[PDB]
Amino acid sequence: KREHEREVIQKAIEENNNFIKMAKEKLAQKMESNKENREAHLAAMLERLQEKDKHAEEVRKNKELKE
């Protein structure tokens, strides 16, 4: 009986720790992924904007090769 009593409480500990561990890891995953996703969204915006610049230089350059 004592062996069983010892196993019940160790089981309760293990499950509570496992719950903490899994909450902890799920959160780190979500935050990592969120960070990357957002950064990738902003990076694409800037690249698009920088192609706009690229394109305006190309325009001024063509006006010059016309004059």
Binding site: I20, A23, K26, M31, S33, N34, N37, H41
Partner: protein, 440 residues
């Protein structure tokens, strides 16, 4: 011992916090400077009100509370208003930029920048407790902070305080006073992410409170101030067992044992009576039987739904004021001989009763009549899932066209999180159907 820490998150959370703490102060005889002349042990104690208030050596009774919001203008009113001396400044935490009605900003973009500080301050409250029982978290479903920051916080609290109890007071959205089209998204996202981290959650349907204010208090166009005063009476009724002592007093945790048959089925329906104007209450003494009767009138529920079309899994009556068991028992006997109170076949049908003798109080300048006795019923009914059904349907309408979803995706979220949250909600509605089906 048995301390409870309150955390008020975002505008709704904070403003409801204002109302509750003002009310607690009045109930306990605490002045707005924090002094409480009736309390003879200076700088500490183990009185029942100490579950919610700590004490400094100088005799100040300080709420065990943190207020958090991502913009400052609501908390700035606490900092500068009537109960400003009640709170240590570090208990009131603000960012500069809010979540803009966007769960993703509350949980991630903006929320991530203040979360460690918030936990630091909560930890400071915890360290002053000798037997912390758990947390009470107040927040809207609909706001970006109320939804997304609350979720983040609950997730972090599970990690940092293990299985310590976490109870919510959750403001469910109504079109009469809602401020964002995307509230159904925020509501489903936060309900999904918080569900495994909360032990018990009292939903407060703004439309139910709005109707009660219009109909029972004759308020033409209720403001948050009207709503919040009524909410605070209900919150006070639920927490009174923690804050007062008494022979007939029954601890909230004991009601919880009966209220939660399975971890996910943890949303009690609260019903409160009497809500009556000073004009109507004058020369009209509402008896124990009358207020108990009123608990089974759906118009008095804090969430719109029809318990008469569902099944009960528990019924608890929390009385306060001038009430004795004889009268309660007689009232209950009548109600059984005349009402649609049907229980699932696997639950006992006995009503669980607690009585706190301290009479209800009202805030000066308020709408509610001061009464001699009041009651809050907490029932676990399958009907509460109607509230999830209404919300889930609004979510579906928009999500089918992916309306507004780019606002979340732009803040780093994925469609996968939407479908995952919605599926969890589908499974929850199914859980509520299953528990009502008869045993084989």
């Amino acid at each position: 011992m048995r301390e409870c820490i309150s955390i008020h998150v975002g505008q709704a959370g904070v403003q409801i916090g204002n109302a509750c703490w003002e009310l607690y102060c009045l109930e306990h005889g605490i002045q707005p400077d924090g002094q409480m002349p009736s309390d003879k042990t200076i700088g500490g104690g183990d009185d029942s009100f100490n579950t919610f208030f700590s004490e400094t050596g100088a005799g100040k009774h300080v709420p065990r509370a943190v207020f958090v919001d991502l913009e400052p203008t609501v908390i700035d009113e606490v900092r500068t208003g009537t109960y400003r001396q009640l709170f240590h400044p570090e208990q009131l935490i603000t960012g500069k930029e809010d979540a803009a009605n966007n769960y993703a900003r509350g949980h991630y973009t903006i929320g991530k920048e203040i979360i460690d500080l918030v936990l630091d301050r909560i930890r400071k409250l915890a360290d002053q407790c000798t037997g912390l029982q758990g947390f009470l978290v107040f927040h809207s479903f609909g706001g970006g902070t109320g939804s997304g920051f609350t979720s983040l916080l609950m997730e972090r609290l599970s990690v940092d305080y293990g299985k310590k109890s976490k109870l919510e007071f959750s403001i469910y959205p109504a079109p009469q006073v809602s401020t964002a089209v995307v509230e159904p998204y925020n509501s489903i996202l936060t309900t999904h992410t918080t569900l495994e981290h909360s032990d018990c959650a009292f939903m407060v349907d703004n439309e139910a409170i709005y109707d009660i204010c219009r109909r029972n208090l004759d308020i033409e166009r209720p403001t948050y101030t009207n709503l919040n005063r009524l909410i605070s009476q209900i919150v006070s009724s639920i927490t009174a067992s923690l804050r007062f002592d008494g022979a007939l007093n029954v601890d909230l945790t004991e009601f919880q044992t009966n209220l939660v048959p399975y971890p996910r089925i943890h949303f009690p329906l609260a019903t409160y009576a009497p809500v009556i104007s000073a004009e109507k209450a004058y020369h009209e003494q509402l008896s124990v039987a009358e207020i108990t009767n009123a608990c089974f009138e759906p118009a008095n529920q804090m969430v719109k739904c029809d318990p008469r079309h569902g099944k009960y899994m528990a019924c608890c009556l929390l009385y306060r004021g001038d009430v004795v068991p004889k009268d309660v028992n007689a009232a209950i006997a009548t109600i059984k001989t005349k009402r649609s109170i049907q229980f699932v076949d696997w639950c006992p049908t006995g009503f669980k009763v607690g009585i706190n003798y301290q009479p209800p109080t009202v805030v000066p300048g308020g709408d509610l009549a001061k009464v001699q006795r009041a009651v809050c019923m907490l029932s676990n009914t399958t009907a509460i899932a109607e509230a999830w059904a209404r919300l889930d349907h609004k979510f579906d309408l928009m999500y089918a066209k992916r309306a507004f979803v780019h606002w979340y995706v732009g803040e780093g979220m994925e469609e996968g999180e939407f479908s995952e949250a919605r599926e969890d909600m589908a499974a929850l509605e199914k859980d509520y159907e299953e528990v009502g089906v008869d045993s084989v």
